[PDB]
């Protein structure tokens, strides 16, 4: 079988990036540049596109990886510019379907460095349409402008064959992505989402993540309900015996 692939990553109105699309590689994509180039920003934007759960997203420095820094800030807000921003993934499914998943990010006005995230998906987009252009409107002389979610919905609905969906919960977002062969595990419960984010977070910083090795049992071995049922049966028996004894 032909495994699906991540074609490209698009960044809109990000810190440093206005509208930039990196075409990913079949095997390895490398990013270089002096300190502060913005590679970590690209990684963060990708992972935000993958797991938009705001509770999990925490972009600590590679130094103090997992060491509590008490900054009170997850670091995502400072990585976005004012206004609308987008982070999208084009994926070729094993069914050879081009699906553009993505999220609209937006800073929340106020002293708190808080952000709002709204996921979305597009199916059936023609292979000739690039997300960078799809998400921007050419206004002025070579001066494209970004358009909000409502405008994007209007633009896409006017097209033929493209199906756009907007999710009210990251749960359905993950469910749809899993349905299209994008996620290995079905993140039905919040614990599954936490484990998934733990895996990608350990990968990003690389190496032996303390939490992983500490819960390797939970991460590898599957949960069994028969043992739980048997223990509950024994619990009920013991409770009845105690009732009788008392």
């Amino acid at each position: 079988i032909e495994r699906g692939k991540f074609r490209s990553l698009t960044l809109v109105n990000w810190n440093g990036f206005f509208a930039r699309t990196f075409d990913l590689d079949e095997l390895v994509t490398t990013l270089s540049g002096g300190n502060g180039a913005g590679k970590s920003t690209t990684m963060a934007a990708f992972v935000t596109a993958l797991i938009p759960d705001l509770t999990l997203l925490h972009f600590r420095n590679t130094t103090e990886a997992g060491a509590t820094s008490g900054s009170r800030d997850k670091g995502l807000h400072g990585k976005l510019r004012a206004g609308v921003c987008y982070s999208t993934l084009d994926v070729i499914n094993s069914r050879h379907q081009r699906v553009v998943v993505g999220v609209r990010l937006q800073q929340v006005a106020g002293r708190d460095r808080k952000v709002d995230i709204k996921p979305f998906m597009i199916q059936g987009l023609p292979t000739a349409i690039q997300p960078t252009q799809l998400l921007t409107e050419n206004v002025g002389e070579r001066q494209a402008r970004v358009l909000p979610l409502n405008e994007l919905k209007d633009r896409l609905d006017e097209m033929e064959g493209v199906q756009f969906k907007q999710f009210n919960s990251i749960t359905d977002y993950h469910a749809q992505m899993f349905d299209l062969g994008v996620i290995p595990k079905r993140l039905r419960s919040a614990s599954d989402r936490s484990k998934f984010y733990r895996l990608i977070e350990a990968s990003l910083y690389g190496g032996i993540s303390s939490a992983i090795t500490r819960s390797l049992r939970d991460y590898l071995l599957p949960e069994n309900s028969g043992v739980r049922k048997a223990f509950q049966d024994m619990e009920a028996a013991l409770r009845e015996n105690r009732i009788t004894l008392e």
Partner: protein, 233 residues
């Protein structure tokens, strides 16, 4: 009921041991520093095997502990685990939580990561006794095995026609040398794993695609300029 419990735990443990032992042969002697191979050690814990035996055959002998109004079932299990096998010397953790932990079958197996460091055989992998590159390689091996296991488990729910996408990251790749990066590349391609790596210097000039980013201050704001790179010219 206690006998039936112990039996089902034993069967589940045996099945999981067999599955993991079969999976172990999915590794092909990765070369990272002095680490020559990575392996998963699964073993039923004798401290817990004794507990299973007591539950399955000698439940009544310790009823005095079970039927105490002071102890809940989790606390009763914890106290019983304390009674027999008293040399483990658990820490300051409370009886309630340790009992609750005892109620999960997975706990009964020691599940550890072994590495064939140099010529010392297979040794337990402790971050405190491994170089940075060795630890990074071992962690990547663990993560790839975990994602493989997740894919395998979901093979039933998913349709027969879809293979989920595979992708991982590695920031500050400069911590790895050329040999380690070549080994990582060969592993990822053998496992059809996509990788996104970062390093200040182009550490992988002759494989995959590469980009270089330069940040320019420009009219009191910033812009990132991206340039593709090619192996030869």
């Amino acid at each position: 009921s206690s006998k039936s419990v112990a039996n089902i735990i034993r069967k589940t443990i045996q099945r999981e041991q067999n599955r993991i032992r079969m999976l172990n042969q999915g590794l092909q002697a990765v070369s990272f520093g002095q680490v020559r191979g990575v392996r998963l050690n699964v073993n039923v814990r004798e401290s817990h095997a004794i507990l299973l035996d007591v539950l399955s055959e000698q439940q009544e002998q310790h009823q005095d502990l079970f039927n105490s109004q002071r102890l809940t079932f989790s606390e009763a299990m914890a106290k019983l685990y304390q009674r027999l096998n008293p040399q483990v010397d658990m820490g300051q953790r409370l009886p309630q939580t340790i009992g609750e932990e005892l109620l999960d079958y997975r706990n009964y197996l020691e599940l550890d990561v072994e590495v064939n460091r140099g010529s010392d055989g297979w040794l337990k992998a402790e971050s405190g006794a491994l170089s940075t590159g060795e630890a990074i390689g071992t962690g990547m091996s663990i993560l790839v095995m975990v994602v493989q296991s997740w894919e395998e488990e979901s093979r039933r729910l998913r349709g027969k026609d879809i293979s989920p996408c595979r992708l991982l990251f590695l920031d500050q790749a400069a911590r790895l040398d050329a040999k380690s990066i070549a080994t990582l590349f060969e592993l990822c391609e053998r496992l059809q794993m996509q990788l996104i790596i970062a390093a200040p210097e182009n550490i992988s000039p002759e494989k995959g695609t590469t980009y270089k980013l330069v940040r320019k201050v420009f009219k009191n704001h910033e812009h990132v300029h991206v340039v593709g790179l090619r192996g030869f010219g």
